[PDB]
From Swiss-Prot:
Organism: Methanocaldococcus jannaschii (strain ATCC 43067 / DSM 2661 / JAL-1 / JCM 10045 / NBRC 100440)
Mode of membrane association: Multi-pass membrane protein
Record-given protein name: Uncharacterized membrane protein MJ0091
Cystine crosslinks: none
NCBIfam families: calcium/sodium antiporter
GO CC, alphabetical: plasma membrane
Protein's UniProt keywords contain Transmembrane: yes
Gene Ontology process terms (BP): calcium ion transmembrane transport; intracellular calcium ion homeostasis
Length: 297
């Protein structure tokens, strides 16, 4: 039991580690095949693939009548994605953002502010429908602006991508299940801590994929994955949650998200996303996890 837990834990780590690199390599190749930028592949295929845990989690939680957990997971993931994931990644591989990606980040910022505003009284199913529609528009706009028989180069590419994605998603689940089994076996299970960590657990794919990308100096891919995952987490995970049940407002967390998103845009536009920007993101992240209410909703 503690043995099974340790087994899952370690296997999950392995699958996350190697799976993330395969996913990145396959995504980079697919981007070159389709003549789209690494940012675009990161913001679309990679972002959505890695946010599937958040979407399922938020949908399931709201369906099980725990809408606090549903929104806690969605918004907590956005804060994790900028504070921790981008924070670490930016230090590893500093990013200078080109003029068109800047505009994409501005649209991201507007989307986040819009979500925060309509969410002041919580999120209804109509809020969800609107956010989903905007999510869809964002994707098509993003692909438009970043765009332009059986080929073994392409087949290898898609195999790498899909196997890598399977690797990071199964790996994250094993890692989390393994940790939970260890905690249970050692009699240190704590539901409040466990629910606090839900957003982190679902963000393990983004974490490892972004770090793999950053190691290969693929900064546009990192930024696309972070921006796209947050939009997927709001227009997808949060949105679907709100379809099952009204989601209670999380105004403090949304304000933290809006602040981090604003900083991300300002750095992108007027500076760079490099070492000291990443240090700031991590510092704000650490302050957030030190001070936000526990329990993940
Ligand atoms: C072809 C590529 C898609 C592979 C399966 C889709 C997602 C299925 C697995 C997602 C389960 C969601 C979940 O509960 O969290 C797991 C997450 O990986 C951490 O917790
Ligand atoms: C992704 C492309 C753009 C991204 C970001 C741009 C900002 C969008 C905000 C204005 C349009 C909003 C849609 C139409 C107006 C809906 C207003 C609203 O409040 O919808 C929810 C409603 O409150 C439920 O009762
Ligand atoms: C398309 C690009 C050009 C247009 C860019 C527009 C950007 C607007 C985004 C932030 C402003 C806030 C939006 C105002 C929406 C508030 C609606 C509202 O108050 O809805 C209450 C309802 O109860 C909620 O569920
Ligand atoms: C502290 C070191 C962190 C290690 C990284 C692992 C992150 C995932 C752990 C649980 C997330 C989802 C749990 C959802 C259900 C909670 C059930 C529970 O009570 O688990 C509590 C226990 O303390 C949990 O270790
Ligand atoms: C060989 C393998 C190399 C792997 C290298 C990965 C580097 C890990 C970076 C931060 C880990 C965080 C440690 C504990 C995570 C808990 C954070 C938390 O509190 O999450 C709250 C919320 O759920 C979400 O913001
Ligand atoms: C051209 C690049 C691909 C654009 C696809 C946009 C949506 C992808 C859905 C991913 C689901 C996993
Ligand atoms: C023109 C290329 C992009 C087309 C649009 C792709 C839409 C994919 C939608 C995925 C949404 C996942 C969450 C559903 C709730
Ligand atoms: C730029 C506007 C973003 C809004 C950020 C969300 C938090 C809303 C602050 C409201 C504080 C008062 C709440 C009383 C119900
Ligand atoms: C402790 C963290 C403080 C980091 C400040 C960074 C400034 C970023 C822009 C220059
Ligand atoms: C490639 C060299 C990287 C070295 C940069 C040091 C990283 C500092 C991270 C500090 C995190 C700050 C949180 C609050 C103390
Ligand atoms: C790095 C150390 C963390 C710095 C922030 C300290 C905050 C501690 C007080 C939190 C009180 C929250 C009340 C809701
Ligand atoms: C930006 C860095 C994070 C700022 C944290 C402010 C936290 C205030 C207390 C929040 C307690 C949870 C409220 C629901
Ligand atoms: Ca609302
Ligand atoms: Na994602
Ligand atoms: Na995720
Ligand atoms: Na997450």
């Amino acid at each position: 039991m503690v043995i099974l837990g340790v087994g899952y834990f370690l296997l999950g780590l392995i699958l996350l580690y190697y799976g993330s690199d395969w996913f990145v390599l396959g995504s980079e190749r697919i981007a070159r095949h389709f003549n789209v930028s690494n940012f675009v592949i990161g913001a679309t295929v990679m972002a959505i693939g890695t946010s599937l845990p958040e979407i399922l989690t938020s949908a399931y939680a709201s369906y099980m009548h725990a809408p606090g957990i549903s929104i806690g997971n969605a918004i907590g993931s956005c804060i994790c994605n900028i504070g921790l994931v981008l924070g670490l990644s930016a230090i590893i591989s500093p990013i200078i953002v080109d003029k068109n990606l800047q505009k994409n980040i501005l649209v991201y910022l507007l989307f986040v502010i819009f979500a925060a505003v309509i969410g002041i009284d919580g999120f209804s199913w109509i809020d969800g429908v609107v956010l989903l529609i905007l999510f869809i528009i964002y994707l098509r706009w993003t692909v438009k602006n970043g765009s332009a028989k059986n080929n073994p180069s392409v087949v290898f590419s898609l195999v790498l991508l899909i196997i890598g994605l399977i690797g990071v998603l199964v790996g994250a689940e094993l890692f989390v299940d393994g940790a939970k089994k260890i905690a249970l076996a050692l009699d240190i299970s704590d539901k409040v801590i466990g629910f606090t960590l839900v957003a982190f657990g679902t963000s393990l794919p983004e974490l490892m994929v972004s770090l793999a990308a950053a190691k290969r100096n693929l900064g546009g891919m990192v930024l696309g994955n972070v921006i796209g995952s947050n939009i997927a987490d709001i227009g997808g995970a949060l949105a679907v949650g709100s379809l099952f049940m009204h989601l209670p407002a999380e105004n403090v967390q949304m304000a933290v998200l809006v602040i981090m998103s604003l900083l991300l845009y300002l750095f992108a536009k007027y500076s760079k996303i490099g070492r000291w920007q990443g240090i700031l993101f991590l510092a704000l992240y650490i302050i957030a996890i030190a001070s936000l209410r526990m329990g993940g909703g």
